[PDB]
């Protein structure tokens, strides 16, 4: 039941926008994927995913913007 939340690398920053997704619902993933881009204010930064398991469901879609402080995906481990 690992909950993945967007960490604040920079200052406070209160915004979460998804430009590209590296995974899809109903598919398996391995601890080795760095094709995910997360935009905070006005910059694109790539970060590797140190997690693995099974994807249950996706509540967020491409082009969706929401203030920082939520889980973009529920994953069982």
From TrEMBL:
Residue ranges of every copy of the Lipoyl-binding domain listed in the record: 1-76
Family stated for the protein in its record: Belongs to the 2-oxoacid dehydrogenase family.
Protein name: dihydrolipoyllysine-residue (2-methylpropanoyl)transferase
Interval of the full protein contained in this chain: 1 to 77 of 400
């Amino acid at each position: 039941m690992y909950e993945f939340k967007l960490p604040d690398i920079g200052e406070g920053v209160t915004e979460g926008e998804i430009v590209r997704w590296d995974v899809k619902e109903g598919d398996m993933v391995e601890k080795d994927q760095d094709l995910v881009e997360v935009m905070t204010d006005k910059v694109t930064v790539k970060i590797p995913s140190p997690v693995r398991g099974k994807i249950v469901k996706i509540l967020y879609r491409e082009g969706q913007v929401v203030p920082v402080g939520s889980t973009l995906l529920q994953i069982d481990t």
